[PDB]
Design an enzyme around this catalytic site. Structure first.
Site, PDB file in Angstrom:
ATOM      1  N   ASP A  82      12.312   4.030  18.831  1.00 35.38           N
ATOM      2  CA  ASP A  82      11.355   4.075  19.929  1.00 35.38           C
ATOM      3  C   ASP A  82      11.413   5.434  20.630  1.00 35.38           C
ATOM      4  O   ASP A  82      12.495   5.996  20.826  1.00 35.38           O
ATOM      5  CB  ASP A  82      11.703   2.941  20.892  1.00 35.38           C
ATOM      6  CG  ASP A  82      10.532   2.464  21.690  1.00 35.38           C
ATOM      7  OD1 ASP A  82       9.799   1.574  21.218  1.00 35.38           O
ATOM      8  OD2 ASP A  82      10.358   2.958  22.822  1.00 35.38           O
ATOM      9  N   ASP A 115      -2.399   1.007  26.927  1.00 30.63           N
ATOM     10  CA  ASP A 115      -1.012   1.009  27.349  1.00 30.63           C
ATOM     11  C   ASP A 115      -0.244   2.092  26.605  1.00 30.63           C
ATOM     12  O   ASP A 115       0.869   1.881  26.127  1.00 30.63           O
ATOM     13  CB  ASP A 115      -0.382  -0.367  27.142  1.00 30.63           C
ATOM     14  CG  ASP A 115       0.924  -0.533  27.906  1.00 30.63           C
ATOM     15  OD1 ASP A 115       1.122   0.158  28.943  1.00 30.63           O
ATOM     16  OD2 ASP A 115       1.750  -1.352  27.456  1.00 30.63           O
ATOM     17  N   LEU A 138      15.192  -6.758  17.374  1.00 26.17           N
ATOM     18  CA  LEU A 138      15.066  -5.352  17.743  1.00 26.17           C
ATOM     19  C   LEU A 138      14.802  -5.176  19.225  1.00 26.17           C
ATOM     20  O   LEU A 138      15.279  -4.206  19.827  1.00 26.17           O
ATOM     21  CB  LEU A 138      13.953  -4.666  16.949  1.00 26.17           C
ATOM     22  CG  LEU A 138      14.208  -4.668  15.440  1.00 26.17           C
ATOM     23  CD1 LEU A 138      13.014  -4.108  14.655  1.00 26.17           C
ATOM     24  CD2 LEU A 138      15.456  -3.878  15.124  1.00 26.17           C
TER      25      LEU A 138
HETATM   26  N1  LIG Z   1      10.229  -1.187  13.187  1.00 28.29           N
HETATM   27  C1  LIG Z   1       9.452  -1.629  13.884  1.00 28.29           C
HETATM   28  C2  LIG Z   1       8.472  -2.185  14.759  1.00 28.29           C
HETATM   29  C3  LIG Z   1       7.243  -2.580  14.249  1.00 28.29           C
HETATM   30  C4  LIG Z   1       6.303  -3.118  15.113  1.00 28.29           C
HETATM   31  N2  LIG Z   1       6.637  -3.237  16.463  1.00 28.29           N
HETATM   32  C5  LIG Z   1       7.840  -2.838  16.899  1.00 28.29           C
HETATM   33  N3  LIG Z   1       8.368  -2.853  18.120  1.00 28.29           N
HETATM   34  C6  LIG Z   1       9.589  -2.351  18.014  1.00 28.29           C
HETATM   35  C7  LIG Z   1      10.434  -2.195  19.028  1.00 28.29           C
HETATM   36  C8  LIG Z   1      10.048  -2.562  20.312  1.00 28.29           C
HETATM   37  C9  LIG Z   1      10.926  -2.398  21.376  1.00 28.29           C
HETATM   38  C10 LIG Z   1      12.193  -1.871  21.156  1.00 28.29           C
HETATM   39  N4  LIG Z   1      13.037  -1.715  22.182  1.00 28.29           N
HETATM   40  C11 LIG Z   1      14.488  -1.573  22.007  1.00 28.29           C
HETATM   41  C12 LIG Z   1      15.034  -0.595  23.036  1.00 28.29           C
HETATM   42  N5  LIG Z   1      14.781  -1.019  24.427  1.00 28.29           N
HETATM   43  C13 LIG Z   1      13.309  -1.082  24.526  1.00 28.29           C
HETATM   44  C14 LIG Z   1      12.690  -2.080  23.561  1.00 28.29           C
HETATM   45  C15 LIG Z   1      12.581  -1.506  19.872  1.00 28.29           C
HETATM   46  C16 LIG Z   1      11.701  -1.668  18.808  1.00 28.29           C
HETATM   47  C17 LIG Z   1       9.834  -2.014  16.755  1.00 28.29           C
HETATM   48  C18 LIG Z   1       8.741  -2.319  16.057  1.00 28.29           C
END
Ligand SMILES: N#Cc1ccnc2[nH]c(-c3ccc(N4CCNCC4)cc3)cc12
Length: 272
Positions: A94, A133, A11
């Protein structure tokens, strides 16, 4: 353990490590699987019984019961890394990508999102956890239910009433007293960052790019924004920490009244 989970696509990845989509096989629950290398963790907590990433300490403190915080389901230790099992809404986006796509948000949608963030941060603070954060990247939208969920506690700390002299979060969201003096208190630095977040939602971008803009603390609006929303943003971005509003004063502010419920938010604004 990899017999327990089926790993899907990556992801995302960044200073939080690498996060994959996953499925718990015993009941096909959707999960997110996060890998953090030991050598890249800076602050380590420890649980009541062994030495762990501070992030697990804080997540366990806030993962009991329901809230708008992604909950920790399980974790594993590996020789060079820790692996976290975190819940995963489906579909989910996000808030950073959401703002990238839609630009500045209608004040009605920002109010609901902002309200839910406040409720989530308050919950963290009652569990003794300072996030440190808060920003749009660290907020997930459960698109079907219209519920926001806070993520990435890897820069957080136990909440305390004395001064913090360490900070490893996002600088453009950090308060002026951190930039000039490398000192801040938990809740008023959190309010400042919520000021940045609210501005980001209603204008589509953060208000400050450089230290001197942070230190000067003058807010310029590049989009049309109601006078009440402007007044709340500037209150949260008060230069003196003690001039900032309490969590309660934010939620009693006139701009915060008559919030939508989350499922309403989805039906009107997220095509549910
Ligand atoms: N579902 C879920 C979930 C559960 C716990 N942490 C996450 N981080 C993220 C996550 C963290 C980062 C990103 N992005 C993708 C788009 N560019 C910025 C980074 C997309 C998803 C999803 C989750």
């Amino acid at each position: 353990l990899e017999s327990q989970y089926q790993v899907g696509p990556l992801l995302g990845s960044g200073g939080f490590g690498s996060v994959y989509s996953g499925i718990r096989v015993s009941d096909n629950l959707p999960v997110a699987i996060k890998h953090v290398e030991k050598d890249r963790i800076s602050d380590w907590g420890e649980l009541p019984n062994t030495r762990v990433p501070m992030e697990v300490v804080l997540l366990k403190k806030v993962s009991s019961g329901f809230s708008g915080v992604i909950r920790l389901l399980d974790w594993f230790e590996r020789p060079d890394s820790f692996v976290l099992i975190l819940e995963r809404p489906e579909p989910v986006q996000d808030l950073f990508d959401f703002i990238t796509e839609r630009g500045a948000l209608q004040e009605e949608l920002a109010r609901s999102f902002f309200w839910q963030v406040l409720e989530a941060v308050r919950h963290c603070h009652n569990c003794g956890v300072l996030h440190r954060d808060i920003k749009d990247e660290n907020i997930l939208i459960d698109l079907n239910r219209g519920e926001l969920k806070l993520i990435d506690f890897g820069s957080g700390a136990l909440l305390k009433d004395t001064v913090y002299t360490d900070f490893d979060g996002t600088r453009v969201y950090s308060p002026p007293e951190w930039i000039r003096y490398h000192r801040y208190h938990g809740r008023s630095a959190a309010v400042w960052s919520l000021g940045i977040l609210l501005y980001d939602m209603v204008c589509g971008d953060i208000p400050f790019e450089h230290d001197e803009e942070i230190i000067r603390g003058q807010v310029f609006f590049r989009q049309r924004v109601s006078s009440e929303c402007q007044h709340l943003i500037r209150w949260c971005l008060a230069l003196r920490p003690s001039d900032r509003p309490t969590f309660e004063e934010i939620q009693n502010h006139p701009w915060m009244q008559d919030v939508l419920l989350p499922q309403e938010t989805a039906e009107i604004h997220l095509h549910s």
